[PDB]
Amino acid sequence: ESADLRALAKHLYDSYIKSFPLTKAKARAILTGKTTDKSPFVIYDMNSLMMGEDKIKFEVAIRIFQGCQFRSVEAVQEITEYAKSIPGFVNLDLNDQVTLLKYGVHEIIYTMLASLMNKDGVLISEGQGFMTREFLKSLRKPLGDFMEPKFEFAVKFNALELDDSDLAIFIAVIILSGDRPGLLNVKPIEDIQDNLLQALELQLKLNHPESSQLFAKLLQKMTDLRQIVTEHVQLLQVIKKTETDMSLHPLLQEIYKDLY
Amino acid sequence: ESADLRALAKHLYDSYIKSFPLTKAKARAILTGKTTDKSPFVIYDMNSLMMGEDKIKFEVAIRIFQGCQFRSVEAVQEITEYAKSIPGFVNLDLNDQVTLLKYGVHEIIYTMLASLMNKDGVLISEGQGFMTREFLKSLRKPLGDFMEPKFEFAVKFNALELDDSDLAIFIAVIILSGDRPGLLNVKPIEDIQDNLLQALELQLKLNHPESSQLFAKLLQKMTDLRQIVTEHVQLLQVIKKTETDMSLHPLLQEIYKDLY
Ligand SMILES: O=C(O)[C@H](Cc1ccccc1)Oc1ccc(-c2ccccc2)cc1
Ligand SMILES: O=C(O)[C@H](Cc1ccccc1)Oc1ccc(-c2ccccc2)cc1
């Protein structure tokens, strides 16, 4: 039933657009900067970082880690809004909604971060700035280990050349994964996901004449994301046990884990 | 040894001032607004909230809860910086530093929030605005329950009339509490705290001729703070189990608890 699968595709796209201010279209407009309006400021050394403070909405590694922490609090609200717009979702068991969002959230953060990334760096500060990969690599040891797996993921992911209409569906599919630990009622989740998968396959055929095997490749990427989440959690766990400077400890995370 | 206890008092005061941008002196200057420069905008109904968006750095209840979430990520860094400045602290076992900060942090957030509060409301947005207690009480049910215990604590706490020099020591004493669960080496912590307690008693005698029993009253307040943290955690735990709107779930907290 393809009228329905198309209507669902559009519905997903319109909520994505409402929920997520910084889209792939916006990010690529800057990176393909014909639109010189927002030609981004390039932070490529300590010098240009220092100059860039007087023209962006801002130990450099600590700043960056806290930047990630702040971004997570914002991203959760965006993702939660979008999740609620997925037909069927708010009708699920309250505990399953929680479970699905809990595991979906970081997988989606990295999916969307890739929109801002290429092999040379990442857009920062609502696209105002471009921070160089080699600049990041030159910083304090833990920073680099954190970013490089994400870059590597993003280079392979971006070579699939998805647009925002593609991403809306992919992201919904991720949320509606019926194999999350602790799920109570798996069949209704699988039902919604099966229908989302068909909507995704059809969308990819329509939007991509320049490639085949895009659907399969994309489903492999949902597995890769689970690995990236896991490596990330584990780097943080090494820091928690071994880092001697308390300002480099996550810590808010250690508090919510143990006290809350 | 009172030259030392005074030098320590000053050392603590200077780091407090470096670590914490918004002080009690600043907050009281606004609330005793002879300095009309920053006479705060009063959000006292929905109408004045709506007008106040066009003159402050900003469902209203969700905005407020996320505001608290953002503030926590900022506060942890301030508090960690200050903790490191307390003589003896960075020489403790790494695990004990972690433990002390983990339990100290929320107790200090509420201690300092009181600086912004009176029985009629709370300073918001770096003191730019004053949000009314009765306005908060009129909002969505969970909001009110969250704030009222903090107001009640803050009214009794503020009636002790401490200044920033007093607070610096009190806060250090809190961090250096030797009864936190999981501490490895308790005696060195107790040693530093005993000396901080003397510095605190002497400070209070010198700074407060208009009251006696201030030291005792203040130590009772360290126990009260533990209750406020506990009630807070428990309200969040009720929301996690019973709230049907996912946008009203903490959730970042649920993710760090279960996945990290
Ligand atoms: O785990 C998370 O929620 C975020 C996820 C994220 C990763 C990259 C961009 C945006 C978000 O990653 C973090 C990385 C480092 C830290 C952190 C913060 C302070 C001190 C040390 C590490 C916190 C979160
Ligand atoms: O627990 C915390 O870290 C903060 C503590 C805090 C409380 C008042 C002012 C500043 C900080 O309190 C929160 C209160 C509500 C929420 C929250 C966020 C989103 C959805 C529901 C609740 C998060 C934190």
From Swiss-Prot, chains A, B:
Mutation effect (R71H): In colon cancer; sporadic; somatic mutation; partial loss of ligand-binding
Keywords associated with the record: Activator, Biological rhythms, Cytoplasm, Diabetes mellitus, Disease variant, DNA-binding, Glycoprotein, Isopeptide bond, Metal-binding, Nucleus, Obesity, Phosphoprotein, Receptor, Transcription, Transcription regulation, Ubl conjugation, Zinc, Zinc-finger
Major subcellular site: nucleus
Residues covered by the NR LBD domain: 4-258
Tissue expression pattern: Highest expression in adipose tissue. Lower in skeletal muscle, spleen, heart and liver. Also detectable in placenta, lung and ovary.
Subunit composition and interactions: Interacts with FOXO1 (acetylated form). Heterodimer with other nuclear receptors, such as RXRA. The heterodimer with the retinoic acid receptor RXRA is called adipocyte-specific transcription factor ARF6. Interacts with NCOA6 coactivator, leading to a strong increase in transcription of target genes. Interacts with coactivator PPARBP, leading to a mild increase in transcription of target genes. Interacts with NOCA7 in a ligand-inducible manner. Interacts with NCOA1 and NCOA2 LXXLL motifs. Interacts with ASXL1, ASXL2, DNTTIP2, FAM120B, MAP2K1/MEK1, NR0B2, PDPK1, PRDM16, PRMT2 and TGFB1I1.
Function: Nuclear receptor that binds peroxisome proliferators such as hypolipidemic drugs and fatty acids. Once activated by a ligand, the nuclear receptor binds to DNA specific PPAR response elements (PPRE) and modulates the transcription of its target genes, such as acyl-CoA oxidase. It therefore controls the peroxisomal beta-oxidation pathway of fatty acids. Key regulator of adipocyte differentiation and glucose homeostasis. ARF6 acts as a key regulator of the tissue-specific adipocyte P2 (aP2) enhancer. (Microbial infection) Upon treatment with M.tuberculosis or its lipoprotein LpqH, phosphorylation of MAPK p38 and IL-6 production are modulated, probably via this protein.
Family (UniProt): Belongs to the nuclear hormone receptor family. NR1 subfamily.
Protein name (record): Peroxisome proliferator-activated receptor gamma
Source species of the chain: Homo sapiens
Residue window of the full protein shown: 235 to 505 of 505
